[PDB]
Every structure is written in C-alpha cells, then in structure tokens.
Amino acid sequence: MRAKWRKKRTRRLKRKRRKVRARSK
Amino acid sequence: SINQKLALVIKSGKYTLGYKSTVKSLRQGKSKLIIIAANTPVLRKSELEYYAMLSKTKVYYFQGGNNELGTAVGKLFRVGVVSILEAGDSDILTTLA
Amino acid sequence: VVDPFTRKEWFDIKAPSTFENRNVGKTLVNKSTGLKSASDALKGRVVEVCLADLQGSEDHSFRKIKLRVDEVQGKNLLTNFHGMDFTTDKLRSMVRKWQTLIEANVTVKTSDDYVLRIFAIAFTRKQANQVKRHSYAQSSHIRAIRKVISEILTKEVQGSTLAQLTSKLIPEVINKEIENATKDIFPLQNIHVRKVKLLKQPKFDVGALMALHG
Amino acid sequence: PKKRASNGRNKKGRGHVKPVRCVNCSKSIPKDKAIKRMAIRNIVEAAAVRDLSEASVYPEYALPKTYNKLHYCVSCAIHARIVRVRSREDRKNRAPP
Amino acid sequence: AKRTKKVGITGKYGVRYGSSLRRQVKKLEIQQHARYDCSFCGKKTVKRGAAGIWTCSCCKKTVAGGAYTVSTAAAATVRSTIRRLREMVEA
C-alpha cells in the first residue's frame, strides 16, 4: 500500500473525524 | 549625469527655487540657467519661455517636476523652477541642458 | 451523372517578365454554368511550385515561388509576383547541429504604393583551422547580426516595388551585401532571404502590371 | 541504489529543464531525458529508388530529404528503439557510430 | 493603531452581512477613501469627490478616472494604446 494513496486515506478520515467532533462542537 | 551635475551647483553655486524668487532673479538679470518641469502649468511655463529669451538664458525642459526635479535638488518640498544665477564648480552652461 | 471534367475548361499560366519560361503551366478553370461565370470565378488562387523550374535554373534545386492569380486576358492568365517560399527539405538541410540558427523577419513598404514582409535566415560556421566541435555566436554578436540584417533588407527595397526586388531576390544579390556586414564580425554560412508574403497592394491595377506583361 | 552519474539522465548545472512530448505515446518527459535521433532519410523506399529516377523527369534532378527528430519516452523507446538494456560496465559507454 | 486586526475599515459591518462580501469591499473601499495624488500639480490633493470624479485641492483640478481608483487596468493600457499609435500619428 503506497503512502501517496494512504496519506489520502488518513486525509479522508481526517475531514471525517474533524466534522464528527465538530458535530458535538 | 544631469543628476549629480546640479548636485554640485546646489553644493556651491547660487540657485533660486520658486516663481517669485526666480522671476525676481530674472528681473535683476543675473541667472543664466532656468529648468522648467514638462508637467507644471504651461501658462507658468509660457511666460518663463518668454523670459528665457528676454533674460538670455538656456532653458531646458527637465524630464521631471515638483517631486522629480525636487527629488534630486535634495529637498523634501516641491519645486519645478531651478533658476540658477551663477554655477559653482559644475559647467551646466556648456552641456546637454 | 455528368462527370464535371467535361465542364472545367483548361487554363494556362503566364509569369510577369522577370521569370524564365513565362508559360509557367496548364491547369483547370470552370465552364460558365448556373449562377457562376468564368474569368471572375477563380483569381483567388495561388501558383506555388519549384522556383528552379519557373526560373529554369537547376542550381536552385530548393526555393519555391508563390503567385496570386490577378486578371486574365484571352484565357491566358497573367499571374503577379505574390511572393516567395522555401522547400522544407532545404530548411532542415541548412540546419546543422553544433551551430546556432538565426531566423529574421522585418516589414518594408515601396515608394510606389505597396507593402510586404521579407525574411533573411542566417547560420554560424567554423574557421579556416577551427578545432572546437561546436562554434556558436557571442549573443551580443547575434544582435549586431540581425541588426544590419533587417537594416539592409529595407535599404534597397525603395524602388519599382517587388518587381525590381525579385530582380535581386532570386539572383541572391542579397547574400552579397548582407555577407559584407557579417564579415567584420562572425563569418556565418548560407545567409539567404528564406521566405516572404505580400498583404497590401494599391488595388487591382493591372495598368501598373503592364511593365511585366507586354 | 543510484546506477547512473547524471542521476537517471543528464541533469547537472541547472535546476529544471522543459519536458518535450514523446514522439510515440505522447508521455511528457524532460528534454534532457529525451533520447533523440535524426532520421534524415529519403522518401524513396528500398527498391523503387532507381525506378523513380527512371520514370522521372529532370537530369537526375537532386532528390529531397526529410530531416526529422525522434524524441522517446524511454518505456516505449525500449519496447523497440535502440537500447536493449546495455551491459553493466558499458553503461557509462557512449558512441556516435 | 490595532483597534481591529484583519477587519480594518470594514469592521463596522459586524455580524450583519457576510465575511467574504466585506473582504472584497475592504480592498476597493480602502481605494477611493485614500488621499490620491493629482499627477498634474504633483501634490496628492486629489480624491473621490464623486464616482469617476477626482477633485484636486490645489488649482481645484477635478479629474476623470475610475469608479474607485484614479485609473484601473482599463484606462491604463488604453491610455498607452494611444501613446503607442500616436507614434505613427506624427512619426
């Protein structure tokens, strides 16, 4: 698993866990 | 370099900045150098071109004006007429002016 | 179902007066039919071909001449010098490696109402006892090169429009005075006039075009 | 590890070039990483060359040449063009003939 | 001084309106209010006395310019287009 597409995975789970924690802001 | 040429003339010679003082130095007949700004009132210029010949002086349409001619004549304030009476150690008499 | 070749009438080309065989060629026209005439049905054409043929000079293996059809008389079209071309096969030929290429372009008008844009290529050559496997110009030298290149072109243009210009165009008298300036600086090889094209004429005045056609 | 001096292909003295499009699968590869060749061949084949001059006009004429340039992408320049993964030692080797 | 931060002269539009809008306003608002220069008397006494009007405090010289600047990108290149063609006008 190349880190180019893996930095993209964490990237999606980043906007993801920032909006879920920002849901209960 | 017309820049440093008048640097010495103000650093030695007798110069007069301003319509009155310059037309007053011309009405006395002891200035042989008048530098006009190609942006200042041509009404003002028109008479100074007419005095140029009346006071036998070599005019010179300066590539500048108040904050151009004034910039090099080392003074924070504005001026467009540098009517030189007698130069110091610079021969702006026989040059490209 | 008519096979329109039966329609199209055959033509014949006739160069100005400063060309070898004025009878440049035989082509096709258009028989007068529905909502169309003949003499004023073409003209908006050209005449590009091997200049060596239209000049009968086999030494001009390359180079080409461009002619715009003007007025026709007696089904014998009297073409006019529309300009000059350069076989792409010779452009690449003169472009050798380890040297510098110099293409020039400038505009110039004639004293007898007319405008065109002539060219003049140039290339860097070696020395009598050259050693380096390169040999390029000094750039600022390339500037003095192109400086007098366009300079000289527009110095002999004034006179008899492109009629007298072609009288020095194909004979390559250009290279002679152009090579004179290039000598005191960098030798260079070739140095021709490449191509060129017209853009402004006085009008459709074949009265002036009578000097070549007679 | 690194197996060439100029990294992969000639790149020393500057910082960036200008990539030219491959003449095969259009792959954009730097002008310094471009394997060129001048195929300035004729338009005649390998048989009708004399049949041309024969069924032709003009005293042999002169015959034309098409000076072309062949840029390559390396990947497709190996699936054909001159290369064939050279020997280890002669990797440094270079030759015009 | 710093009674603001990044809001500058548009901090008055507080909660009312939108952030993006005012941001744009700032750039142009800051433009016409500014004590512009009368490049005819050589003293920056000219200013937006009205839209497309810039009056000089000296010699009372009213000036034709832009809707916010003494001259935008428009009259800029066009002013030189004339200088450029005014060349084949006498030369």
Added chain:
Amino acid sequence: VLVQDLLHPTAASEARKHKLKTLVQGPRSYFLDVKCPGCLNITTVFSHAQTAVTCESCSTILCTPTGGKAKLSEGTSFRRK
C-alpha cells in the same frame, strides 16, 4: 613534488600564474610615457586606464580605455614605464 625550492624559482612559472597564488602579489601592469602628436610633451599613462586619458596642453586623447590595457588610439608612440 617530493622536494622543491620556493626562494629562487623559475621566473617562468613565477610571472605567468595568478599574481595572488604565485607569492608576494606583484602588479603585472606598467605605465607608458606616450608622445602626444601636435605639441612636445608626454603623459604617464597607466595600462588599465578605464577613464578616457587625454592631453593637457592641446587636449585630444591618449588611448581609448578598453577591457584591460587601454590600447593606443591609432597614431600614438607608446613607451614602457
């Protein structure tokens, strides 16, 4: 290499290399008491002039200052020192 003297060395590899890597930096220039045609005097002209050196009596020009040693101006009799 191995062993060499650096006191009385060849005046060859001495006055050819860089006068900064040779030894005691020595100026490789000089002046010229060139004659000024049209009077009777001579001017002590420095090799690398740069500033247009001319006459003093019937002023004219001595040598045009080039990108090194101001070569004479066509007709001028130069003399070392």
Added chain:
Amino acid sequence: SQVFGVARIYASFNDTFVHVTDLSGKETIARVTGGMKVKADRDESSPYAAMLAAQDVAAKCKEVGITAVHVKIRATGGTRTKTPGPGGQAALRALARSGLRIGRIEDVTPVPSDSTRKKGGRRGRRL
C-alpha cells in the same frame, strides 16, 4: 513543356489520400481514398491498399490528360505521430510504376509546434 501539377499524397497512420490537383489546387482532380479499394479497417494504411489506391488515381489522370505531377507527401503531424505512415510507401511506387512524369517532388507536412497539447496526458497513452 507538359501539364504538370501536384499529387498531394497523405501518409497518415491508417489512411492515405492521393488527390492529384493543380499548382493552386483550388481546382482538384480525382482523390481516391484508401479504404475505397479495400473494406477492412485494419488495412487503411496497409501498402497493398496504397498501390491499388494510387493505381486507380493513375487511370483517372490519363482521362483528363495530365502528364507531369509533383507528389507533396504529408504526415498526420501537428500533434500526432509526425511519422509518415506505411501508405506513403507503396503509393509513390504505385503511380511511379503506373507511368507518369514524376516531377519536382518535395514535402509540406503539419509543422508540429509542440505548443498545442498532444492528446494523451502527462502519463501518456499507456497502451
């Protein structure tokens, strides 16, 4: 001394047009496309098609009465292969063997400026 002209052969990959015209061309003579003499797609740039295509254009010429002709070959170029297809091979040898006065032949293909993008992408056409 004859009725010369131009052939304007087009050696594009998967096609070849042999339309003999005049010095101007504003008025053309014949054209005969490649797939005209062969329906198969795969053989549009094939050599046998070029001969048969250039063989038919030769017969059409002696119908109007044209003698000499100048073949101006053209590659797809521009932003394409720029490499003269296999058609412009047996096409020249087709009208040469047909019996025409092959004249001052030159060339004028589309000058690939490189300027305009070459359809494919940065990672190119990864066949």
Added chain:
Amino acid sequence: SGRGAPLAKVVFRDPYKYRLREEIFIANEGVHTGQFIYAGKKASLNVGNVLPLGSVPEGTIVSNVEEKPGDRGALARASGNYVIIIGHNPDENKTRVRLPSGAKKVISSDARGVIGVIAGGGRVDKPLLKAGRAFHKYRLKRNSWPKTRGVAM
C-alpha cells in the same frame, strides 16, 4: 445623478455665429477639467478627441459612437464599457468594430466616435452590500426595485 460615469460638459462656439453653446459629450477615463477636445477628421488621435472613424485604425478604442454614422451618440455609453475596432475597408466607407457581449457591427467611416473608455473602472465589480445603496440606486432610475418573486404571489 442616475449614471456610474461622469459627463463631459464640453462647451463649443459656432463658426457660423459669434457665440458658444455648451455641447455635452461623455467622460473618458483619462481626461482633466480644462483638457482639450478636438472634433473634425483633421485632428490628431487623442482621448476625448472625436472625428469620424475614417480617421483611426484597428486596435484603436473609442466610446459614445453610433450605428447611424452621425446620430450624435448611440453605442459605447457605459461604466467600464469600451469599444475596440478591428477591420477597416475604405471606398464606400464601411469599418468593422467590436461591441460589449462580443457583437460586431460594420459602419460608414463618417461615423462619429470619441477616443477613450467611459469613466467607471470595476464599478459593479464591487458589492452594493446594504439594500440602502440598493434603494437610492434605483432612487434615480425607476421603481423597478425591489422584485417580488412570481412563484410566491
């Protein structure tokens, strides 16, 4: 008061009677109060100067021109709006010009046109923000403001 670009209060004499009636041209981004305007084909190419288009060439931009050569103003009337000129065919005077959304209208070379764009750079390229400047906007135009949406009534 109803336009986002100043008006030239250009006063003129009358060579047919000792007198001076003030004509009214439009303002050009690049003119001064006391600036000199010249009208008559026999005048140098300068901003504010107005001569038929049989005086200027292509690329040359003007404003407050016509469609009817000499209707005393027509096309080229607006803030930050300009009109370039491309083609130019003499004899039977018919020049080709370039209008706003990309329109091209050919016209006689005796078509009056003043050199220079109408004052108002990036005017509407700025937000109105407060409906206030929106009220007083049409306060000098017409009661077309506001705009009741159809779907709701």
Added chain:
RNA sequence: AGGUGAAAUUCUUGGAUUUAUUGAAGACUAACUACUGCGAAAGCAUUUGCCAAGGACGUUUUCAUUAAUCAAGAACGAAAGUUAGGGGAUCGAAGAUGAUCAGAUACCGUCGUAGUCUUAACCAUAAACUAUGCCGACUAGGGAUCGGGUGGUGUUUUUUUAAUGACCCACUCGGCACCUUACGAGAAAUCAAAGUCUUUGGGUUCUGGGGGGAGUAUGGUCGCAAGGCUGAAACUUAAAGGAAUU
C-alpha cells in the same frame, strides 16, 4: 473519414474526410538546444524597446575586520488546489459512455465542465534530488567546455601591410560537469569528496536513535478550505531496513 492488437461509439452520400484563397482567438516558442548559459531556491527555453538588477574577469582605486553561520523571525517558492474577473485553442481531473474483460466502476477509444494562462490576491507544499548544509585553506593529474584577462613579426579580414574584429597555441583565476586511478574513505555501491576520523577536535546551522501506531490523537497556531508549521501515548512486535553475492 476518425480510431485500435483488432473493434465499436463518432462525423456518413442536406457533400463529409481530404485541397486551397483568406480572417480571428487563445496557446506556444519546436528544429537551433548539448553530460552548456543565467538565476538564491523554484526556475528561465522566440524578437525588439525601456527600466533597473545580477556576476565572472581584470585594475599600482576606497574603506578597513566591517566577517562566518544561523533559533524566533522575514522575501520568493514549480504544480495541484483557491477568491474572483478578462477567456477554456488544445488538452483534459470528474463524468458520460465504445469494447476489451469471467467483471472493468480501470488500462486503450470518442466528447467533455475544473484547471490551463493572464490581471490582483492566496495557501507554502514536490523523489522542492546534488536523496550529499554554509564558510575555511590544503591531499591530483588529464582532457574538455563557459566568461573575462595577458602574450604571439601567428590564420583571416586584402580596400594598400591600412586600424582591427573573428580563429588558432600556452597559461590563467572564477563557471560546468566528466574521465582516470584512489593514495584515503566507505557496509558496498561509490565518492578529488564522504580525503585531511581511535593517528578521533578549523567554525557552525539543523536533524535522527529497532519497527509499527504515526506528521497520527490532542492543544496551539497559520490558512477562505483542502489542510499546513507543531506533535504524542497506549499497545504490540525480534525483527524491519541498506548494500552486495549466490
């Protein structure tokens, strides 16, 4: 006609595809152009004009330690992405679809909005590579090649030996890399630097410590965002990795 390994969609016999006379748009600058130039890095590939810059060389000019390198901090920072307007010619993320394919949401094909690029602002990241910091003198020869400098009764310029410009040979510092052994170093590959390092110390910036978790949690902080600068822990694991050989 287009196109492919070969097809199909697509433009078909209201004239396509192909030829040519003209016109406009935007884009770009081919060939010349390379183990070369310049730039601080990114980069910069046409010409002219203006306006300045930069830098080698050379100088029997001026000052006179003014310097070196740098936390925090500040200018520029390709491209993507972005706010918005001049406008997307090509190409072309997405998408649509033609087949291939057991399938194909891909690879190849046709079109096509972002973007392209400009005008004014942004984010500050790239295998941003010379994976090799800046400065210091010395351990090495060679051929080249770049720029300027000196020497030549030398080549040519021939219009008179006219002045000289280009070229040829030695050397030269400052450029650019390469070749040669490598004395030495180095795990080897290699490297005139990574030499001058157990015989270990010319000054100094910055960084790293088995591997994962992980540029991640969280806080701050910059950013219009995307995210950037900043940066864990638990837990688990005795192998992971580099080079060179078989």
